[PDB]
mmCIF file of C-alpha atoms in Angstrom:
data_model
loop_
_atom_site.group_PDB
_atom_site.id
_atom_site.type_symbol
_atom_site.label_atom_id
_atom_site.label_comp_id
_atom_site.label_asym_id
_atom_site.label_seq_id
_atom_site.Cartn_x
_atom_site.Cartn_y
_atom_site.Cartn_z
ATOM 1 C CA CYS W 1 0.000 0.000 0.000
ATOM 2 C CA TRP W 2 2.390 2.642 -1.317
ATOM 3 C CA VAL W 3 -0.343 5.281 -1.600
ATOM 4 C CA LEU W 4 -3.043 5.608 1.060
ATOM 5 C CA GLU W 5 -5.836 8.095 0.412
ATOM 6 C CA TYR W 6 -9.195 9.199 1.755
ATOM 7 C CA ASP W 7 -11.997 9.406 -0.795
ATOM 8 C CA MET W 8 -14.590 12.293 -0.517
ATOM 9 C CA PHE W 9 -16.834 9.950 1.592
ATOM 10 C CA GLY W 10 -14.358 9.472 4.484
ATOM 11 C CA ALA W 11 -13.134 5.952 3.450
ATOM 12 C CA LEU W 12 -9.468 4.987 3.080
ATOM 13 C CA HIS W 13 -8.136 3.287 -0.083
ATOM 14 C CA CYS W 14 -4.845 1.837 -1.267
ATOM 15 C CA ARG W 15 -4.119 3.594 -4.649
ATOM 16 C CA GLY Q 26 1.766 -7.923 -2.692
ATOM 17 C CA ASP Q 27 4.845 -5.869 -3.707
ATOM 18 C CA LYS Q 28 8.071 -7.299 -2.128
ATOM 19 C CA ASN Q 29 9.687 -3.781 -2.240
ATOM 20 C CA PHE Q 30 6.901 -2.416 0.033
ATOM 21 C CA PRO Q 31 8.281 -2.047 3.637
ATOM 22 C CA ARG Q 32 6.386 -4.602 5.858
ATOM 23 C CA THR Q 33 7.669 -2.574 8.891
ATOM 24 C CA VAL Q 34 8.332 1.153 9.237
ATOM 25 C CA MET Q 35 9.589 3.267 12.157
ATOM 26 C CA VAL Q 36 7.259 5.759 13.792
ATOM 27 C CA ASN Q 37 8.177 8.395 16.358
ATOM 28 C CA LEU Q 38 5.067 8.615 18.613
ATOM 29 C CA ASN Q 39 5.949 12.148 19.885
ATOM 30 C CA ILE Q 40 3.331 14.322 18.133
ATOM 31 C CA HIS Q 41 4.428 17.989 17.734
ATOM 32 C CA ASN Q 42 3.517 19.386 14.233
ATOM 33 C CA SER Q 43 -20.450 25.893 23.049
ATOM 34 C CA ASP Q 44 -21.122 22.216 21.966
ATOM 35 C CA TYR Q 45 -23.191 21.204 18.994
ATOM 36 C CA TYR Q 46 -24.274 17.691 20.172
ATOM 37 C CA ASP Q 47 -26.961 19.462 22.291
ATOM 38 C CA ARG Q 48 -27.870 22.502 20.116
ATOM 39 C CA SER Q 49 -28.149 20.614 16.794
ATOM 40 C CA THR Q 50 -31.561 19.936 15.148
ATOM 41 C CA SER Q 51 -30.097 16.359 14.837
ATOM 42 C CA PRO Q 52 -28.620 16.074 18.375
ATOM 43 C CA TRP Q 53 -26.476 13.150 19.506
ATOM 44 C CA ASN Q 54 -25.130 11.332 22.535
ATOM 45 C CA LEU Q 55 -21.581 10.098 22.900
ATOM 46 C CA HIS Q 56 -20.574 6.526 23.795
ATOM 47 C CA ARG Q 57 -17.071 5.832 25.217
ATOM 48 C CA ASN Q 58 -14.958 2.846 24.169
ATOM 49 C CA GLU Q 59 -11.672 1.934 25.848
ATOM 50 C CA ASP Q 60 -9.236 -0.768 24.640
ATOM 51 C CA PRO Q 61 -5.657 -0.799 26.121
ATOM 52 C CA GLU Q 62 -4.480 -2.813 23.041
ATOM 53 C CA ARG Q 63 -5.302 0.191 20.840
ATOM 54 C CA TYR Q 64 -3.426 3.541 20.662
ATOM 55 C CA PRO Q 65 -5.369 5.807 21.074
ATOM 56 C CA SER Q 66 -6.963 3.619 23.758
ATOM 57 C CA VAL Q 67 -10.160 5.761 24.097
ATOM 58 C CA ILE Q 68 -12.510 6.647 21.215
ATOM 59 C CA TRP Q 69 -16.017 8.022 21.327
ATOM 60 C CA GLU Q 70 -18.963 7.122 19.057
ATOM 61 C CA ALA Q 71 -21.803 9.571 18.322
ATOM 62 C CA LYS Q 72 -25.288 8.090 18.400
ATOM 63 C CA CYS Q 73 -28.138 10.219 16.975
ATOM 64 C CA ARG Q 74 -30.689 10.913 19.716
ATOM 65 C CA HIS Q 75 -33.760 10.840 17.512
ATOM 66 C CA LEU Q 76 -35.134 9.338 14.260
ATOM 67 C CA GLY Q 77 -36.400 12.792 13.183
ATOM 68 C CA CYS Q 78 -35.012 16.317 13.654
ATOM 69 C CA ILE Q 79 -35.974 18.916 16.300
ATOM 70 C CA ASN Q 80 -38.280 21.697 14.995
ATOM 71 C CA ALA Q 81 -38.703 25.373 16.134
ATOM 72 C CA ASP Q 82 -41.180 24.182 18.895
ATOM 73 C CA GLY Q 83 -38.657 21.719 20.387
ATOM 74 C CA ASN Q 84 -40.515 18.637 19.085
ATOM 75 C CA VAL Q 85 -39.315 15.761 16.866
ATOM 76 C CA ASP Q 86 -40.281 16.288 13.187
ATOM 77 C CA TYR Q 87 -40.410 12.789 11.612
ATOM 78 C CA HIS Q 88 -40.571 14.244 8.052
ATOM 79 C CA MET Q 89 -36.780 14.785 8.371
ATOM 80 C CA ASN Q 90 -34.084 12.322 9.451
ATOM 81 C CA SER Q 91 -31.134 12.555 11.859
ATOM 82 C CA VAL Q 92 -28.215 10.616 10.309
ATOM 83 C CA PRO Q 93 -24.656 10.058 11.600
ATOM 84 C CA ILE Q 94 -21.674 11.594 9.732
ATOM 85 C CA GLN Q 95 -18.963 8.863 9.629
ATOM 86 C CA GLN Q 96 -15.346 8.600 8.668
ATOM 87 C CA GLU Q 97 -12.590 6.057 8.919
ATOM 88 C CA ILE Q 98 -9.759 7.004 11.263
ATOM 89 C CA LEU Q 99 -6.314 5.482 11.797
ATOM 90 C CA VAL Q 100 -5.222 3.887 15.084
ATOM 91 C CA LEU Q 101 -2.376 1.565 16.150
ATOM 92 C CA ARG Q 102 -3.109 -2.020 17.341
ATOM 93 C CA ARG Q 103 -0.417 -3.588 19.605
ATOM 94 C CA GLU Q 104 1.079 -6.594 17.755
ATOM 95 C CA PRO Q 105 2.115 -8.948 19.369
ATOM 96 C CA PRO Q 106 -0.546 -8.310 22.065
ATOM 97 C CA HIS Q 107 0.631 -6.066 24.972
ATOM 98 C CA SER Q 108 3.697 -4.905 22.972
ATOM 99 C CA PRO Q 109 4.944 -1.467 24.054
ATOM 100 C CA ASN Q 110 6.828 -0.820 20.796
ATOM 101 C CA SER Q 111 5.345 -2.912 17.934
ATOM 102 C CA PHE Q 112 1.971 -2.252 16.230
ATOM 103 C CA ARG Q 113 -0.115 -2.790 13.133
ATOM 104 C CA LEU Q 114 -1.886 0.137 11.466
ATOM 105 C CA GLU Q 115 -5.673 -0.217 11.775
ATOM 106 C CA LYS Q 116 -8.701 1.676 10.473
ATOM 107 C CA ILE Q 117 -11.959 2.206 12.384
ATOM 108 C CA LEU Q 118 -15.273 3.634 11.143
ATOM 109 C CA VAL Q 119 -16.365 6.282 13.669
ATOM 110 C CA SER Q 120 -19.534 8.446 13.881
ATOM 111 C CA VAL Q 121 -18.465 12.010 14.622
ATOM 112 C CA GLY Q 122 -21.892 13.649 14.973
ATOM 113 C CA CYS Q 123 -25.245 13.819 13.268
ATOM 114 C CA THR Q 124 -26.821 15.954 10.571
ATOM 115 C CA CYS Q 125 -30.446 16.432 9.478
ATOM 116 C CA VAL Q 126 -31.390 15.243 5.977
ATOM 117 C CA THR Q 127 -34.461 15.318 3.725
ATOM 118 C CA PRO Q 128 -35.621 11.633 3.487
ATOM 119 C CA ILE Q 129 -35.720 9.556 0.307
ATOM 120 C CA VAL Q 130 -39.533 9.550 -0.340
ATOM 121 C CA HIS Q 131 -41.120 8.913 -3.796
ATOM 122 C CA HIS Q 132 -44.326 10.710 -4.901
ATOM 123 C CA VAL Q 133 -45.693 7.588 -6.688
ATOM 124 C CA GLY Z 30 9.807 13.551 29.137
ATOM 125 C CA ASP Z 31 9.982 9.927 30.389
ATOM 126 C CA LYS Z 32 13.269 8.217 29.284
ATOM 127 C CA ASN Z 33 11.509 4.768 29.385
ATOM 128 C CA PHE Z 34 8.997 5.957 26.727
ATOM 129 C CA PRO Z 35 9.983 4.448 23.296
ATOM 130 C CA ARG Z 36 11.069 7.393 21.015
ATOM 131 C CA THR Z 37 10.635 4.956 18.044
ATOM 132 C CA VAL Z 38 8.179 2.093 17.568
ATOM 133 C CA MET Z 39 7.649 -0.371 14.700
ATOM 134 C CA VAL Z 40 4.465 -0.204 12.664
ATOM 135 C CA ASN Z 41 3.278 -2.711 10.079
ATOM 136 C CA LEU Z 42 1.457 -0.552 7.465
ATOM 137 C CA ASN Z 43 -0.604 -3.517 6.107
ATOM 138 C CA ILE Z 44 -4.116 -2.735 7.414
ATOM 139 C CA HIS Z 45 -6.344 -5.857 7.730
ATOM 140 C CA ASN Z 46 -8.404 -5.820 11.015
ATOM 141 C CA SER Z 47 -27.195 8.293 -0.911
ATOM 142 C CA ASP Z 48 -24.871 11.174 0.292
ATOM 143 C CA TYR Z 49 -25.705 13.586 3.052
ATOM 144 C CA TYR Z 50 -23.497 16.556 1.956
ATOM 145 C CA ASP Z 51 -26.281 17.424 -0.561
ATOM 146 C CA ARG Z 52 -29.466 16.358 1.317
ATOM 147 C CA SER Z 53 -28.557 17.942 4.684
ATOM 148 C CA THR Z 54 -30.322 21.117 5.954
ATOM 149 C CA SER Z 55 -26.670 22.227 6.637
ATOM 150 C CA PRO Z 56 -25.124 21.054 3.319
ATOM 151 C CA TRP Z 57 -21.392 21.144 2.615
ATOM 152 C CA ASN Z 58 -18.790 21.059 -0.127
ATOM 153 C CA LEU Z 59 -15.601 19.043 -0.001
ATOM 154 C CA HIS Z 60 -12.093 20.437 -0.568
ATOM 155 C CA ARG Z 61 -9.228 18.060 -1.527
ATOM 156 C CA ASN Z 62 -5.724 18.337 -0.070
ATOM 157 C CA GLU Z 63 -2.793 16.251 -1.297
ATOM 158 C CA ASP Z 64 0.671 16.108 0.340
ATOM 159 C CA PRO Z 65 3.072 13.254 -0.705
ATOM 160 C CA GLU Z 66 5.004 13.769 2.600
ATOM 161 C CA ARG Z 67 1.898 12.660 4.516
ATOM 162 C CA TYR Z 68 0.423 9.116 4.723
ATOM 163 C CA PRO Z 69 -2.491 9.193 3.958
ATOM 164 C CA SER Z 70 -1.451 11.648 1.233
ATOM 165 C CA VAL Z 71 -5.049 12.783 0.400
ATOM 166 C CA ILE Z 72 -7.526 14.224 2.931
ATOM 167 C CA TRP Z 73 -10.743 16.092 2.329
ATOM 168 C CA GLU Z 74 -12.122 19.079 4.285
ATOM 169 C CA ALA Z 75 -15.865 19.804 4.541
ATOM 170 C CA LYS Z 76 -16.847 23.440 4.138
ATOM 171 C CA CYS Z 77 -20.429 24.412 5.095
ATOM 172 C CA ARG Z 78 -22.218 25.811 2.039
ATOM 173 C CA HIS Z 79 -24.311 28.374 3.867
ATOM 174 C CA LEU Z 80 -24.369 30.567 7.015
ATOM 175 C CA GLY Z 81 -27.966 29.458 7.738
ATOM 176 C CA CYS Z 82 -29.803 26.150 7.235
ATOM 177 C CA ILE Z 83 -32.109 25.127 4.351
ATOM 178 C CA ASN Z 84 -35.849 25.262 5.216
ATOM 179 C CA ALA Z 85 -38.840 23.232 3.829
ATOM 180 C CA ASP Z 86 -39.113 25.749 0.868
ATOM 181 C CA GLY Z 87 -35.465 25.236 -0.175
ATOM 182 C CA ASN Z 88 -34.360 28.682 1.071
ATOM 183 C CA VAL Z 89 -31.641 29.667 3.576
ATOM 184 C CA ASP Z 90 -33.080 30.300 7.080
ATOM 185 C CA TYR Z 91 -30.618 32.674 8.824
ATOM 186 C CA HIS Z 92 -32.269 32.093 12.253
ATOM 187 C CA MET Z 93 -30.319 28.783 12.351
ATOM 188 C CA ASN Z 94 -26.613 28.159 11.737
ATOM 189 C CA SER Z 95 -24.695 25.579 9.683
ATOM 190 C CA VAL Z 96 -21.569 24.602 11.673
ATOM 191 C CA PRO Z 97 -18.792 22.104 10.843
ATOM 192 C CA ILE Z 98 -18.372 18.928 12.958
ATOM 193 C CA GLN Z 99 -14.587 18.526 13.534
ATOM 194 C CA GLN Z 100 -12.268 15.927 14.927
ATOM 195 C CA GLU Z 101 -8.560 15.352 15.146
ATOM 196 C CA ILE Z 102 -7.280 12.422 13.101
ATOM 197 C CA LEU Z 103 -3.910 10.658 13.063
ATOM 198 C CA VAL Z 104 -1.608 10.616 10.022
ATOM 199 C CA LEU Z 105 2.078 9.788 9.432
ATOM 200 C CA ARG Z 106 4.560 12.529 8.368
ATOM 201 C CA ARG Z 107 7.705 11.282 6.529
ATOM 202 C CA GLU Z 108 10.752 12.098 8.709
ATOM 203 C CA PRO Z 109 13.413 12.668 7.364
ATOM 204 C CA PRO Z 110 11.595 14.191 4.342
ATOM 205 C CA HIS Z 111 10.912 11.708 1.471
ATOM 206 C CA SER Z 112 11.660 8.708 3.748
ATOM 207 C CA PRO Z 113 9.876 5.529 2.627
ATOM 208 C CA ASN Z 114 10.149 3.841 6.042
ATOM 209 C CA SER Z 115 10.530 6.465 8.824
ATOM 210 C CA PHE Z 116 7.738 8.779 10.080
ATOM 211 C CA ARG Z 117 6.509 10.915 12.936
ATOM 212 C CA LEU Z 118 2.942 10.563 14.214
ATOM 213 C CA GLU Z 119 0.923 13.717 13.483
ATOM 214 C CA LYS Z 120 -2.570 14.968 14.310
ATOM 215 C CA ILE Z 121 -4.764 17.068 12.003
ATOM 216 C CA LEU Z 122 -8.063 18.829 12.763
ATOM 217 C CA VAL Z 123 -10.501 17.884 9.980
ATOM 218 C CA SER Z 124 -14.113 18.990 9.275
ATOM 219 C CA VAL Z 125 -16.145 15.891 8.464
ATOM 220 C CA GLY Z 126 -19.491 17.518 7.620
ATOM 221 C CA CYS Z 127 -21.888 20.121 8.906
ATOM 222 C CA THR Z 128 -24.840 20.169 11.275
ATOM 223 C CA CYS Z 129 -27.572 22.757 11.905
ATOM 224 C CA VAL Z 130 -27.639 24.433 15.332
ATOM 225 C CA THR Z 131 -29.853 26.907 17.200
ATOM 226 C CA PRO Z 132 -27.724 30.125 17.508
ATOM 227 C CA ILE Z 133 -26.540 31.678 20.768
ATOM 228 C CA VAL Z 134 -28.959 34.690 20.961
ATOM 229 C CA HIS Z 135 -29.845 36.520 24.237
ATOM 230 C CA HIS Z 136 -33.349 37.959 24.854
ATOM 231 C CA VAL Z 137 -31.968 41.074 26.642
ATOM 232 C CA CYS K 8 2.862 9.829 25.812
ATOM 233 C CA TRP K 9 2.121 6.392 27.249
ATOM 234 C CA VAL K 10 -1.652 6.890 27.058
ATOM 235 C CA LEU K 11 -3.257 8.639 24.086
ATOM 236 C CA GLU K 12 -6.990 9.299 24.259
ATOM 237 C CA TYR K 13 -9.760 11.152 22.469
ATOM 238 C CA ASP K 14 -11.947 13.350 24.656
ATOM 239 C CA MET K 15 -15.760 13.553 23.913
ATOM 240 C CA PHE K 16 -15.068 16.644 21.690
ATOM 241 C CA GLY K 17 -12.831 14.849 19.141
ATOM 242 C CA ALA K 18 -9.456 16.151 20.510
ATOM 243 C CA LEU K 19 -6.491 13.918 21.363
ATOM 244 C CA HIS K 20 -4.718 14.121 24.752
ATOM 245 C CA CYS K 21 -1.701 12.529 26.394
ATOM 246 C CA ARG K 22 -3.021 11.058 29.733
#
Protein backbone atom coordinates (compact mmCIF):
# COMPACT_ATOMS: atom_id res chain seq x y z
CA CYS A 1 0.00 0.00 0.00
CA TRP A 2 2.39 2.64 -1.32
CA VAL A 3 -0.34 5.28 -1.60
CA LEU A 4 -3.04 5.61 1.06
CA GLU A 5 -5.84 8.09 0.41
CA TYR A 6 -9.20 9.20 1.76
CA ASP A 7 -12.00 9.41 -0.79
CA MET A 8 -14.59 12.29 -0.52
CA PHE A 9 -16.83 9.95 1.59
CA GLY A 10 -14.36 9.47 4.48
CA ALA A 11 -13.13 5.95 3.45
CA LEU A 12 -9.47 4.99 3.08
CA HIS A 13 -8.14 3.29 -0.08
CA CYS A 14 -4.85 1.84 -1.27
CA ARG A 15 -4.12 3.59 -4.65
CA GLY B 1 1.77 -7.92 -2.69
CA ASP B 2 4.84 -5.87 -3.71
CA LYS B 3 8.07 -7.30 -2.13
CA ASN B 4 9.69 -3.78 -2.24
CA PHE B 5 6.90 -2.42 0.03
CA PRO B 6 8.28 -2.05 3.64
CA ARG B 7 6.39 -4.60 5.86
CA THR B 8 7.67 -2.57 8.89
CA VAL B 9 8.33 1.15 9.24
CA MET B 10 9.59 3.27 12.16
CA VAL B 11 7.26 5.76 13.79
CA ASN B 12 8.18 8.40 16.36
CA LEU B 13 5.07 8.61 18.61
CA ASN B 14 5.95 12.15 19.88
CA ILE B 15 3.33 14.32 18.13
CA HIS B 16 4.43 17.99 17.73
CA ASN B 17 3.52 19.39 14.23
CA SER B 18 -20.45 25.89 23.05
CA ASP B 19 -21.12 22.22 21.97
CA TYR B 20 -23.19 21.20 18.99
CA TYR B 21 -24.27 17.69 20.17
CA ASP B 22 -26.96 19.46 22.29
CA ARG B 23 -27.87 22.50 20.12
CA SER B 24 -28.15 20.61 16.79
CA THR B 25 -31.56 19.94 15.15
CA SER B 26 -30.10 16.36 14.84
CA PRO B 27 -28.62 16.07 18.38
CA TRP B 28 -26.48 13.15 19.51
CA ASN B 29 -25.13 11.33 22.54
CA LEU B 30 -21.58 10.10 22.90
CA HIS B 31 -20.57 6.53 23.80
CA ARG B 32 -17.07 5.83 25.22
CA ASN B 33 -14.96 2.85 24.17
CA GLU B 34 -11.67 1.93 25.85
CA ASP B 35 -9.24 -0.77 24.64
CA PRO B 36 -5.66 -0.80 26.12
CA GLU B 37 -4.48 -2.81 23.04
CA ARG B 38 -5.30 0.19 20.84
CA TYR B 39 -3.43 3.54 20.66
CA PRO B 40 -5.37 5.81 21.07
CA SER B 41 -6.96 3.62 23.76
CA VAL B 42 -10.16 5.76 24.10
CA ILE B 43 -12.51 6.65 21.22
CA TRP B 44 -16.02 8.02 21.33
CA GLU B 45 -18.96 7.12 19.06
CA ALA B 46 -21.80 9.57 18.32
CA LYS B 47 -25.29 8.09 18.40
CA CYS B 48 -28.14 10.22 16.98
CA ARG B 49 -30.69 10.91 19.72
CA HIS B 50 -33.76 10.84 17.51
CA LEU B 51 -35.13 9.34 14.26
CA GLY B 52 -36.40 12.79 13.18
CA CYS B 53 -35.01 16.32 13.65
CA ILE B 54 -35.97 18.92 16.30
CA ASN B 55 -38.28 21.70 15.00
CA ALA B 56 -38.70 25.37 16.13
CA ASP B 57 -41.18 24.18 18.89
CA GLY B 58 -38.66 21.72 20.39
CA ASN B 59 -40.51 18.64 19.09
CA VAL B 60 -39.31 15.76 16.87
CA ASP B 61 -40.28 16.29 13.19
CA TYR B 62 -40.41 12.79 11.61
CA HIS B 63 -40.57 14.24 8.05
CA MET B 64 -36.78 14.79 8.37
CA ASN B 65 -34.08 12.32 9.45
CA SER B 66 -31.13 12.55 11.86
CA VAL B 67 -28.21 10.62 10.31
CA PRO B 68 -24.66 10.06 11.60
CA ILE B 69 -21.67 11.59 9.73
CA GLN B 70 -18.96 8.86 9.63
CA GLN B 71 -15.35 8.60 8.67
CA GLU B 72 -12.59 6.06 8.92
CA ILE B 73 -9.76 7.00 11.26
CA LEU B 74 -6.31 5.48 11.80
CA VAL B 75 -5.22 3.89 15.08
CA LEU B 76 -2.38 1.56 16.15
CA ARG B 77 -3.11 -2.02 17.34
CA ARG B 78 -0.42 -3.59 19.61
CA GLU B 79 1.08 -6.59 17.76
CA PRO B 80 2.12 -8.95 19.37
CA PRO B 81 -0.55 -8.31 22.07
CA HIS B 82 0.63 -6.07 24.97
CA SER B 83 3.70 -4.90 22.97
CA PRO B 84 4.94 -1.47 24.05
CA ASN B 85 6.83 -0.82 20.80
CA SER B 86 5.35 -2.91 17.93
CA PHE B 87 1.97 -2.25 16.23
CA ARG B 88 -0.11 -2.79 13.13
CA LEU B 89 -1.89 0.14 11.47
CA GLU B 90 -5.67 -0.22 11.77
CA LYS B 91 -8.70 1.68 10.47
CA ILE B 92 -11.96 2.21 12.38
CA LEU B 93 -15.27 3.63 11.14
CA VAL B 94 -16.37 6.28 13.67
CA SER B 95 -19.53 8.45 13.88
CA VAL B 96 -18.47 12.01 14.62
CA GLY B 97 -21.89 13.65 14.97
CA CYS B 98 -25.24 13.82 13.27
CA THR B 99 -26.82 15.95 10.57
CA CYS B 100 -30.45 16.43 9.48
CA VAL B 101 -31.39 15.24 5.98
CA THR B 102 -34.46 15.32 3.72
CA PRO B 103 -35.62 11.63 3.49
CA ILE B 104 -35.72 9.56 0.31
CA VAL B 105 -39.53 9.55 -0.34
CA HIS B 106 -41.12 8.91 -3.80
CA HIS B 107 -44.33 10.71 -4.90
CA VAL B 108 -45.69 7.59 -6.69
CA GLY C 1 9.81 13.55 29.14
CA ASP C 2 9.98 9.93 30.39
CA LYS C 3 13.27 8.22 29.28
CA ASN C 4 11.51 4.77 29.39
CA PHE C 5 9.00 5.96 26.73
CA PRO C 6 9.98 4.45 23.30
CA ARG C 7 11.07 7.39 21.02
CA THR C 8 10.63 4.96 18.04
CA VAL C 9 8.18 2.09 17.57
CA MET C 10 7.65 -0.37 14.70
CA VAL C 11 4.47 -0.20 12.66
CA ASN C 12 3.28 -2.71 10.08
CA LEU C 13 1.46 -0.55 7.46
CA ASN C 14 -0.60 -3.52 6.11
CA ILE C 15 -4.12 -2.73 7.41
CA HIS C 16 -6.34 -5.86 7.73
CA ASN C 17 -8.40 -5.82 11.01
CA SER C 18 -27.19 8.29 -0.91
CA ASP C 19 -24.87 11.17 0.29
CA TYR C 20 -25.71 13.59 3.05
CA TYR C 21 -23.50 16.56 1.96
CA ASP C 22 -26.28 17.42 -0.56
CA ARG C 23 -29.47 16.36 1.32
CA SER C 24 -28.56 17.94 4.68
CA THR C 25 -30.32 21.12 5.95
CA SER C 26 -26.67 22.23 6.64
CA PRO C 27 -25.12 21.05 3.32
CA TRP C 28 -21.39 21.14 2.62
CA ASN C 29 -18.79 21.06 -0.13
CA LEU C 30 -15.60 19.04 0.00
CA HIS C 31 -12.09 20.44 -0.57
CA ARG C 32 -9.23 18.06 -1.53
CA ASN C 33 -5.72 18.34 -0.07
CA GLU C 34 -2.79 16.25 -1.30
CA ASP C 35 0.67 16.11 0.34
CA PRO C 36 3.07 13.25 -0.71
CA GLU C 37 5.00 13.77 2.60
CA ARG C 38 1.90 12.66 4.52
CA TYR C 39 0.42 9.12 4.72
CA PRO C 40 -2.49 9.19 3.96
CA SER C 41 -1.45 11.65 1.23
CA VAL C 42 -5.05 12.78 0.40
CA ILE C 43 -7.53 14.22 2.93
CA TRP C 44 -10.74 16.09 2.33
CA GLU C 45 -12.12 19.08 4.28
CA ALA C 46 -15.87 19.80 4.54
CA LYS C 47 -16.85 23.44 4.14
CA CYS C 48 -20.43 24.41 5.10
CA ARG C 49 -22.22 25.81 2.04
CA HIS C 50 -24.31 28.37 3.87
CA LEU C 51 -24.37 30.57 7.02
CA GLY C 52 -27.97 29.46 7.74
CA CYS C 53 -29.80 26.15 7.23
CA ILE C 54 -32.11 25.13 4.35
CA ASN C 55 -35.85 25.26 5.22
CA ALA C 56 -38.84 23.23 3.83
CA ASP C 57 -39.11 25.75 0.87
CA GLY C 58 -35.46 25.24 -0.18
CA ASN C 59 -34.36 28.68 1.07
CA VAL C 60 -31.64 29.67 3.58
CA ASP C 61 -33.08 30.30 7.08
CA TYR C 62 -30.62 32.67 8.82
CA HIS C 63 -32.27 32.09 12.25
CA MET C 64 -30.32 28.78 12.35
CA ASN C 65 -26.61 28.16 11.74
CA SER C 66 -24.69 25.58 9.68
CA VAL C 67 -21.57 24.60 11.67
CA PRO C 68 -18.79 22.10 10.84
CA ILE C 69 -18.37 18.93 12.96
CA GLN C 70 -14.59 18.53 13.53
CA GLN C 71 -12.27 15.93 14.93
CA GLU C 72 -8.56 15.35 15.15
CA ILE C 73 -7.28 12.42 13.10
CA LEU C 74 -3.91 10.66 13.06
CA VAL C 75 -1.61 10.62 10.02
CA LEU C 76 2.08 9.79 9.43
CA ARG C 77 4.56 12.53 8.37
CA ARG C 78 7.71 11.28 6.53
CA GLU C 79 10.75 12.10 8.71
CA PRO C 80 13.41 12.67 7.36
CA PRO C 81 11.59 14.19 4.34
CA HIS C 82 10.91 11.71 1.47
CA SER C 83 11.66 8.71 3.75
CA PRO C 84 9.88 5.53 2.63
CA ASN C 85 10.15 3.84 6.04
CA SER C 86 10.53 6.47 8.82
CA PHE C 87 7.74 8.78 10.08
CA ARG C 88 6.51 10.92 12.94
CA LEU C 89 2.94 10.56 14.21
CA GLU C 90 0.92 13.72 13.48
CA LYS C 91 -2.57 14.97 14.31
CA ILE C 92 -4.76 17.07 12.00
CA LEU C 93 -8.06 18.83 12.76
CA VAL C 94 -10.50 17.88 9.98
CA SER C 95 -14.11 18.99 9.27
CA VAL C 96 -16.15 15.89 8.46
CA GLY C 97 -19.49 17.52 7.62
CA CYS C 98 -21.89 20.12 8.91
CA THR C 99 -24.84 20.17 11.27
CA CYS C 100 -27.57 22.76 11.90
CA VAL C 101 -27.64 24.43 15.33
CA THR C 102 -29.85 26.91 17.20
CA PRO C 103 -27.72 30.12 17.51
CA ILE C 104 -26.54 31.68 20.77
CA VAL C 105 -28.96 34.69 20.96
CA HIS C 106 -29.85 36.52 24.24
CA HIS C 107 -33.35 37.96 24.85
CA VAL C 108 -31.97 41.07 26.64
CA CYS D 1 2.86 9.83 25.81
CA TRP D 2 2.12 6.39 27.25
CA VAL D 3 -1.65 6.89 27.06
CA LEU D 4 -3.26 8.64 24.09
CA GLU D 5 -6.99 9.30 24.26
CA TYR D 6 -9.76 11.15 22.47
CA ASP D 7 -11.95 13.35 24.66
CA MET D 8 -15.76 13.55 23.91
CA PHE D 9 -15.07 16.64 21.69
CA GLY D 10 -12.83 14.85 19.14
CA ALA D 11 -9.46 16.15 20.51
CA LEU D 12 -6.49 13.92 21.36
CA HIS D 13 -4.72 14.12 24.75
CA CYS D 14 -1.70 12.53 26.39
CA ARG D 15 -3.02 11.06 29.73
